[model samples]
Target chain A: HPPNRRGISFEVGAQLEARDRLKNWYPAHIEDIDYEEGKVLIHFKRWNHRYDEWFCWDSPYLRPLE
Target chain B: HPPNRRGISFEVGAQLEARDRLKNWYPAHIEDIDYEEGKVLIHFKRWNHRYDEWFCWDSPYLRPLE
Candidate 1:
């Protein structure tokens, strides 16, 4: 196990999909990770940087890009 | 206004999308509405009825299908 958090081993720039308020999954990438807080900052692709969101490693809103 | 509930005018068979636990929006339609309780029963397209879910009319996890 590579220092997993909540059963997820996340790294910066990992491709993922995050759910938005509209319940739509958008292409996203991890910009930063706070292992100590079990959180990750996600930046949506092709969206404004201001829309970046923070989510827990195990959040239901985050999932691997498929 | 056709008896709106929580600002939304819902009816049976209205197409929509509801968020799942994984936060993905799937094709769904209204199976029933309970204006008294401000809730709507959603049935996902091609999914078993057992997977149906109920959500408030104005829930952030529910949205019009695009």
Candidate 2:
């Protein structure tokens, strides 16, 4: 689980990879993190301000591009 | 939140009326919200960023001002 702390500190506006979602390995930005639900959602530059669905913190997907 | 469908949309730089902690009764700015933990901590103007404390979203305190 990444950044499982009590605050949302995922470094907004950073580049990340969508490790999951078949054929959807597009790069994305961390829109938000649900600490209570242990989920991580993202926003693609292509999608404008709309955010993609959330992925569980334990999910093998949602890896940083760095 | 208050905008807690997902994502931290609590309207940063806005004044919020808190109802929980006695000392925290003072005004606070919507510094950041942890959507996962459902917690909303703030930075008090009086403390001048030296308090080193955080507030919760649902401590029976924390409401929008008008």
Candidate 3:
């Protein structure tokens, strides 16, 4: 994961095949849709896009592109 | 998210049992906690607070933490 406010890091969840949509790949617990400035900074269970494996992204993170 | 800023929609992620310690049930990736004015604007992977088997959250999303 990347470094932000907190000092903790996260792991990347799973990989997607071209068609594997994020919803199908992410878990269900995540929610609360709000708006920031203009750039959509959504909270997602994501990690840093590494080589083979991915790191889980933690609090204060951004969502993947649509 | 209701087509306001980015004009995009997302699906839901996964759900957990009760004992789900968040750090567990959810994928290894996902972290970060911040404080806003009044409400807690967190970054997590999530779906619309709708019915199960509902939809997915895209670039703008959230997650359930412990």
Candidate 4:
């Protein structure tokens, strides 16, 4: 069993969605999902030549269809 | 494509390094790192028979850093 980059959390599904939606274009993952509040958090992975490093952006701004 | 197991949080960097540094042998991912606040957050992905589920940990006691 290999571990997918998307870890388990209340936000797992959302991460998968954003990952796919951006066509791997976005170097980020939906890390935290506040289920009670309907808010999803984001993490920027794989610092691309086009993006910033050690940076974290939230959903809506990060996720495509956020 | 392989996901390196980090979720988007303000704390991703410190989190990834911590995971690698600990040589954790544990099932957790750096879920969030809050840069503005200088805190690292974590998510427990797989449960070792000795651990809990959906639990989160932080640096200080986590990473070899500080």
Candidate 5:
């Protein structure tokens, strides 16, 4: 079986990629990690703070930065 | 007479636009201000930190955000 979200770990400040409205991979950084809620606060690079959002830890919209 | 660099002031955290190499206006924010050197550190939005740069307080390349 392939690695799954439950087996993955994320750290704050790590650079990552998040899916955007247009289904493009957008560069971002982890601002906060919510272990209890299984969510992470993602801050998009070069974007306004208003665009920052939270996503489930195992969300398909999130991935390691390419 | 039109206002010039000496009469203009910039504050950190203010949103602004910086002219890129292609002569296109890019969104950015004031990261720091150096009064003595008359320069302002600009952080480009949605760009890598490596792209941040300093511009003279009154540089024509800098303009209020549209």
Candidate 6:
């Protein structure tokens, strides 16, 4: 995570995307958050397309949308 | 590769970065090109930093800097 995001914040239902990896980001939403585990459940904005179903992703990979 | 990049172009010594990925791109330079292999040798602008030295990266990952 970027130093500025040491305490990044977000909540369930927030629009987000996997923006800290080696691939282009796609849209998703925070379905759940497990702060202690440093993970979140991300539901693809539109499943059954490139990827289906929600995924447990590293929280740092998520970029909250405005 | 994206359709618009069907004919992407660049030359050795060109400034570039892996901009097509989710992670923020870092500075790099095209050190070598293997046309047949569809790969390129990228030398990070400054060695011994986040990613030091040259790397053989997939051509598509190399976004030529203007």
Those runs of model 5 whose alpha carbons end farther than 4 Å from true positions after fitting are: A1-9, B1-66
Q: Estimate each model's TM-score.
A: 0.45, 0.37, 0.15, 0.22, 0.45, 0.33
What is model 4's DockQ versus the real complex? 0.02
| Candidate 5 residue pairs that clash | A45-B46, A46-B45, A46-B46
lDDT of 1 at B13: 82
How far off is each candidate at the interface, as Cα RMSD in Å? 14.8, 16.9, 9.5, 12.7, 4.1, 17.5
Fraction of the reference Cα-Cα interface contacts (below 8 Å) that each candidate reproduces: 0.00, 0.00, 0.00, 0.00, 0.30, 0.00
Backbone clash pairs for candidate 4 read: A42-B8, A43-B8, B10-B33, B10-B34, B11-B32, B11-B33, B11-B34, B12-B33
Residue B32 lDDT, candidate 5, scale 0-100: 90
Q: Write the per-residue lDDT of candidate 3 for residues A1-66, one digit (tens) a residue.
A: 133423221222322121113423332211222222222122333322221222233322333222
lDDT of 2 at A49: 45
TM-score, model 5 to reference: 0.45
User: CA lDDT of A32 in candidate 4?
Assistant: 51
What tens-digit string does per-residue lDDT give for candidate 6 at A1-66? Answer: 212343334567667666422244556676676666556666544333334333334444556454
lDDT of 3 at B34: 20
Q: Is candidate 1 or candidate 4 better by TM-score?
A: 1
- Model 4 chain B: worst 10 consecutive residues (lDDT sum): B46-55
lDDT of 4 at B17: 22
Per-residue alpha-carbon lDDT of candidate 4 for residues B8-58, written as tens digits (9 for 90 to 100)? 233343332234232332234545444555544554332232322222344
Candidate 2 residues B1-66, lDDT tens each?
A: 354423223665657655433332444577766777766667643333444245566554555544
Query: What lDDT score is found at residue A35 in candidate 2?
Result: 76
Query: Model 6, B27: alpha-carbon shift in Å?
Result: 26
Better of 2 and 6 by TM-score: 2
Q: How close is candidate 1 to the true structure, as a TM-score?
A: 0.45
lDDT by residue (tens digit), candidate 3, B1-66: 122223211212223221122332321121221222211212222322221121122222323332
- State each candidate's clash count: 0, 4, 44, 8, 3, 1
Local error of candidate 4 at B16, Å? 26
Better of 1 and 2 by TM-score: 1
CAPRI-style quality class for the chain A–B interface of candidate 4: incorrect
